[PDB]
RNA sequence: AGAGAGA
């Protein structure tokens, strides 16, 4: 499953992410964790939990690998 | 389930939480319950029952510790 | 269950509440019932079926007691 | 179950309703029929498929005797 | 059977033009083409687009259709 | 399933489909992966992991068959 | 709460 892989990737490798909602707000930050429904996600020092239904779109500074 | 360790956590501390909406709208108060659909804040004194899927992001006033 | 108690205070007790849309519009009125995906609102005696997924939040006039 | 009855009621009765979507858009008219994910809603003699997903709320002209 | 499909049907059918408004108001011309349980696809001047079912408000014919209610 | 067989198809003849989002912002890149909730797009290098839920409409370069 | 898409 891709979404899974992505997240736990950028998790284990601390890749800043810029996160856009569905609304266009923009959060950016290091994803701490994620489960079926919320990523957790760090902004210089703040946990946000976010709902996976308010994601639109996940663009990391470094690129994942993947399968 | 990190999601219900997160609103628990601070339920249980009294923690002061700002709720983003999906609306624009910024609420900011204490979690006093919710269930799988809906999280009750308490704003100033004031319930709201406000729809988790109205909401976008929930900043603590201080990090919550969890098991991941 | 939180929701359901909440609305069936309010109900009962003919709690004249806020209902603020997704869309940031705002609602002022009383409930009449509900199911899973709707509410019933009076507001000045006009009937209005709202589906919960347009719904942001309800802010009562006067706090729910829920166990 | 709320929703069928008003729907059905306002069907059979041809009530005009004011339909506001998610965006705030009305559209005005009588309901013809509906399903699980829409409802038929015809408007100055042209039909609509509306998503009850792009659905805020139904305002009736008369209210609707309900169970 | 439902009224989604027997619709959907009917207008790809007689390569009626529809109007579909989008969520954000947004509205597309076009003939669908097909249509699965979670998206339609229209053609809008010889151009497919892919839509979502989540993201369509309305589909509005110019010309109306039949119905079995 | 045309929406599986569209994703698909863009995939592997590697098109220019253009990505609407609800909130009508857009993106072109290429389709690189999908699963039941996202699709990874790859836009100017850079991969973009999208919710299907936020999705409004593709638009490819050259049509597709289906 | 009245509908044409670069957060």
New binding site residues.
Partial sequence: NIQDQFLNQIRKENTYVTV?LLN???LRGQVKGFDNFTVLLESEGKQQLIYKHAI??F?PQKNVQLE
């Fill in positions: 856009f266009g707000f923009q639109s779109t663009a």
